């Protein structure tokens, strides 16, 4: 059959199982961040040009995809040169801030909290005090990942991570950042989907279903 | 929009408002240092702007 | 809030079309005003203040029983998806604000006269997309479905958390003391019928506790002596119309909290319900709660009409069910008195009279319904009285069971 202009082949085929959500341990998060090359481990140039170390767009992964740049980073974007350098620096210098508050040797076997870790790292890049996020950078798998964000504290003030009793309003990540020299003009550049922007979405995390009705 | 703060406020440079003033004032700084401007309008005056 | 309700229309009692007259549509759902949260604007402090006797609607409950039938014929959206129209009448807009004569050039497809159509607040993708606005239509279809799943008396729900009354629930009630059972369901109804209120909202606990106390009173237990957290309803002395009820915070022994969650669906069983302003304002009120909270669980199937079996989302039969009890005003009140008599509330020779007093009363709200029944046939396409066959009146339903469900609910 066909839906509008799109044609759909007869056969139906989907994955048949779902991998249980696995929260990254504190050590793995520490290695992912402090690896020789962050490229691939953290971020990944979508279309890196061989000739010269240049990349129009860069799709990012987890502890980075959360981050949403401040105006000063958007205006006057950097080149794939200092970009790798910027992160290869900040990713490391961030591990410091976070590890000195939680000596790895004693507490590495503790799952970091996907959410806070994101905002805690994204806020670090934008250069915002990261004191508050650390308090609960971990959480026992039993307590919901989005619940620890609420139970630990109902702090409705920190921009980009307003935690209420039932929901956590944070600015969506940026699965795509665009290094200077990017243009949606060329048909070749990878489809960024507007996410190269900082505030294109607003991920509202909710605790329970009734908590969600109240949100919608 | 942001929730009312119960602590102490200090003019911050983040926020739509603030950013809107910062990028736009960054645009007219570009209008002033542009080809057109640069050729006509004097030099030292264009710095003042 | 709450975005999910499942309804079931009335049953065209062995009749063709929906038992409601056009003269009715312009008597409740007319005037163009939103016929929604209006159900309650037809009740008084009691019965002696209403045109609920010999008239177009000869019953203190003959209104809702009609407005409910009228709602069935105009709820096709939730049945299928489109708006439709029943006899030159169809909601003006997609928000179902009110009814109005079919346009002229762009008329909605004439409704399909079908009885007992289920409803899903989902079959209408616009409902939830506007929730706030047409919030009312929810709580209403609910009031309907709680009278429809039944044939002889609405089926509400009862609760009692194992905890003590929610403080701001002992404060909200202590400001509704003198108020009559009627004006209580008033606030109750009027409340859960505008702006989607979260089931967490204070009021729901209060108005849900006010439906648990009312029941304890209706079965002696929560009497002038054994109060809930301090409340209990005092019924008017039968001899001058005992069909009353007023909330009264006292200070006698507090009926200790139950040993567990006490849930049960109770419905008046004899025709008597149709004319007892208290057996309606109470039941109607207990339904105000369910309306803004989905539906505790599935109402037991066992004792229930034939058109209410396995009613998807509503009725049950398995585990997700709660035994549904049905009491009879007289067999009830009798025990309600015996309870008082046991707690020294009254004399040992006063209960064998209290019953006389009240029993004669029930015999009055009996020769009246029968009269109105054999006055407004039913083959007359209308149902202000709702058939009942001179029998159910004495019918000693569950009763004995609910009299026990009351004790375990207020130990």
CSV table of C-alpha atoms in Angstrom, one decimal, chain A residues 210 212-214 216, chain C residues 1-3 198 200:
chain,number,residue,atom,x,y,z
A,210,UNK,CA,-1.3,11.7,37.1
A,212,UNK,CA,1.7,13.8,33.5
A,213,UNK,CA,-1.9,14.9,33.1
A,214,UNK,CA,-1.1,17.9,35.3
A,216,UNK,CA,-0.1,18.3,29.5
C,1,UNK,CA,-5.9,16.0,36.3
C,2,UNK,CA,-7.7,13.0,34.7
C,3,UNK,CA,-8.1,12.2,31.0
C,198,UNK,CA,-6.2,16.4,40.3
C,200,UNK,CA,-4.8,14.6,44.7
